[model samples]
Target: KETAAAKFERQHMDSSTSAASSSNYCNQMMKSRNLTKDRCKPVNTFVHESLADVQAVCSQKNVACKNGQTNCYQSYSTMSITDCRETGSSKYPNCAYKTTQANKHIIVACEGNPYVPVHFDASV
Candidate 1:
């Protein structure tokens, strides 16, 4: 089974892509990252910052997770990210997405002994 931290990295981390410079970015990423299976994820954000910086967010102030969990933390500095939102015309198996790049203080849920990120809550 994939660890929570590992899962987080797989789904959200992408330091190489510093920008969403192409319209097909979301479409390609959503599919390549395995998020397009069965159906598309309504909204997802890929952080372009280093994994260490993302992990450090666990030491930030506590915040309420979207799911009501108390293990969430928010980044102190704005970081580059690509937000992927499913378009209305998107069909299953051929998921289309709107890619938007921005700098935001991302929020994530942490867990386990090392207290690394587990879930991406949002980018604010």
Candidate 2:
């Protein structure tokens, strides 16, 4: 039987081709149904891992890496870099995170400038 880590490793290794087409497909969908309200919300359920069996799979791979339960710690729903540069905070040449999945499907949400990318891959 193939271990979960082994699977993840293999999957990631071949991820280049999958990643490109996957991202392109997602981008097309977003463009097809452009919306402008998610980023503005208190908690945008942006990019969500459509795979519901993360912990199960990971555990099956390596019991030590078992998470049991899954949840987003502090998923960024929105962010900006334009005004942060003006403050010269140096704390940020400008980096931020946001929810990148929709409740419907695997998705990515580019919140503001310099377009941030979120990845969601659900491989059986």
Candidate 3:
């Protein structure tokens, strides 16, 4: 019999495209700290870092990552890799890490909305 965690994990990572959640994460940091929010660039769409995906990760047979926000915020995307590097490592260094600090505004693109940057998972 599957353990509770295993059960949840299986439910989330069901090996079917329809079963697993479609998720992503993106963040921006500018070379200049005072750069405006409009200057805040769009990070990549990390398909496995969304809340649903976090829920998926927690249901593991073993606690691959801890539970809750702190654990999720830290270990959630610690080892993920994608091609958001702005040409080379000198330009980018794993900026998609989980964050704890609260902010005045969040970066998000609504479904069917038109915005340009790499985050169009539907297109990319």
Candidate 4:
């Protein structure tokens, strides 16, 4: 079974990809990453940093998740990331996304015995 940690890694972590250049990147990557299975994800953020650095955020002070979950943590430093938002004209099976890059503090939810980031909550 795929763990939450692994799922988060697959959906949000892409240390190897270059910073988004063309507008089609989110459209392409969202599909390539398997995030557009039955329907398009409304919004997602991909962190452009080492997996180690991202994991280290779990050790920081905790915060509340968007849904009010209390296991979230905020990154101590602003990180490079790309935000993928589904285009208004996009339809199922033909997902379209707008890619926007920014440097922002990320908030992620952590879990498990050895608490680690398992979900990306938001970026600010």
lDDT of 3 by residue, 17-116 (tens): 2221221212232222222234333332222234454443333222212222122211223322232222232223333322122111112221112211
User: Which is better, 2 or 4, measured by TM-score?
Assistant: 4
Look at candidate 3 and give me any clashing residue pairs.
none
Candidate 4 lDDT, 1-124, residue by residue in tens? 8999999999999798657768988988899899999899989999999999999999976899999999999999999899999888989988889899999999999999778899999999
lDDT of 4: 0.91
Worst 10 residues of 2 by lDDT: 78-87
Residue pairs clashing in model 2 are: 4-61, 46-100, 46-101, 47-99, 47-100, 47-101, 48-101, 76-98, 76-99
Whole-model alpha-carbon lDDT for candidate 1: 0.91
Candidates in order, TM-scores: namely 0.94, 0.18, 0.21, 0.94
Model 2 Cα lDDT, one tens digit per residue, 42-79: 22222223232222222222111123322212222221
lDDT of 1 by residue, 5-95 (tens): 8989989999886778798899999998999997888898999999999999999979999989899999989999999999989888778
Judging by TM-score, tell me the better candidate of 1 and 2: 1
Off by over 4 Å in 3: 1-37, 40-45, 48-54, 61-70, 73-81, 88-124
- Give stretches of model 4 more than 4 Å off: none
- Identify the runs in model 1 with alpha carbons over 4 angstroms from their true place: none
In candidate 1, position 46 carries an lDDT of 93
